[PDB]
Amino acid sequence: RTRVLILGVNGFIGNHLTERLLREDHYEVYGLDIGSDAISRFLNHPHFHFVEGDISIHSEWIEYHVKKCDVVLPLVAIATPIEYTRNPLRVFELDFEENLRIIRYCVKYRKRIIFPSTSEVYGMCSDKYFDEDHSNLIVGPVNKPRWIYSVSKQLLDRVIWAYGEKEGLQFTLFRPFNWMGPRLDNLNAARIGSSRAITQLILNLVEGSPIKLIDGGKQKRCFTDIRDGIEALYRIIENAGNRCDGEIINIGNPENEASIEELGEMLLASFEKHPLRHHFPPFAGFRVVESQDVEHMKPSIRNAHRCLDWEPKIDMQETIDETLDFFLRTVDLT
Incomplete structure (x- = not known):
């Protein structure tokens, strides 16, 4: 069975994705985090394994799990607007630098990485429907520090794209649009998702x-209801026909x-x-x-239609x- 490594599993996406994968009979879940209160119902499951960890402190222990598994989903990041301006250097060190190290472990051991990009990369894009492959990305001057998150996440998308183009990194970027449902992350938790x-x-x-x-x-x-969103994330993991390789997929309900x-x-x-x-x-x-501010954020879901035969x-x-x-x-x- 396929080994899925979820970094930052103690939250919204980790809970719903784990439930999804465990429902099937061919996945082994490795959920890494500093706590497990949000996924305690799974701690005794035969195919779930909790790994103690923190991506800012652990180097080796995380690199090891990357080599041990098949697919990696790095969900740790500070994505609360107030913070972009409140503590930008920390938003940058965690979201950008610490995740870059995990991206590099993935290329080093030739593993598949399913990376959460953000709908914020489009910025003030004028298109009515944000397109992963054709829309221009628009941000304000550097004196509008609220954009440090958007641009950091965008640079990471481009670095992954470069590793994919020059070093055979297998990947898929996904961009969630206001996922919501049971078990919402805490307002200040550094976990991407709700x-x-x-x-x-x-x-x-x-x-x-x-x-x-x-x-x-x-x-x-x-x-987007989490039942629709997680179904799409799940199919990206399935990767039928390898149709998700090198793709960037918006996951939302326009x-x-x-x-x-x-x-x-x-x-x-x-x-x-x-x-x-x-x-x-x-x-x-x-x-x-x-x-x-951004005045509208509608996703084009043509890529999800195409790559996953998905519709909310x-x-x-x-x-x-x-x-x-x-x-x-x-x-x-x-």
Whole structure:
């Protein structure tokens, strides 16, 4: 069976992907992390193996697991906007430098790497649908430090592309668009995966704080149910016909488009009608704040159609209700 090494497994994607792979009978999962509270249900599974580790501290121990396995998914990274400006050097050292070392272990031992790129690489791209193969990438001047994440991730995509072109590195880049569902990562966890904007909004509802609409909350976003997203990530791992080699694949649901404001109204609506509503404070309301920014982020999914015969199937309401439902029921009221 194929050995899948998941770095930063103690979270959203690690939980859902592991469940997916274990459901099949031909994968061996190696989930590396510093904790296991998020994937404890799998610790005793015959085909799951927890590996103690941290990609900033361990060099050898991670290199060893790369050589021991077949496919590598590096999910460790700080992807919370505030931090881009708050501690840029750390965002850069972890997201760029530490991941570059893992990319190099993969080329050294000829392993397959399925790397999480970011929808932020497109930046202020003017296309209505961001295209992995034709869209131009647009960022602000260097005095707009918010772009340090976007550009760091973009450079990594290009370095992987170069290793693939000059040193036979087998790879696939995937770019998630606001994945959401049960078991969302914590707002400040350094694990790539779940939509930060929707987890913040649910947090607003749960904590009794207002939902802040930046400059009106009119900017639009696309949202993807984790059941649709993980199915696509899973098929990239399957790699039928080797159709994913050298590919860059956006994984999102371009039909689930909504502004921060509308997303807020949809969660509130599902919130007010939920059985556990009474265990949460009254709605603090919408606060129009006013602090660069991206005004729309829609993915072209032609590559996913082509390489994976994939099409998102869950309705917007279904994703909203299930993500909110799981969250409210998992919260410790003590």
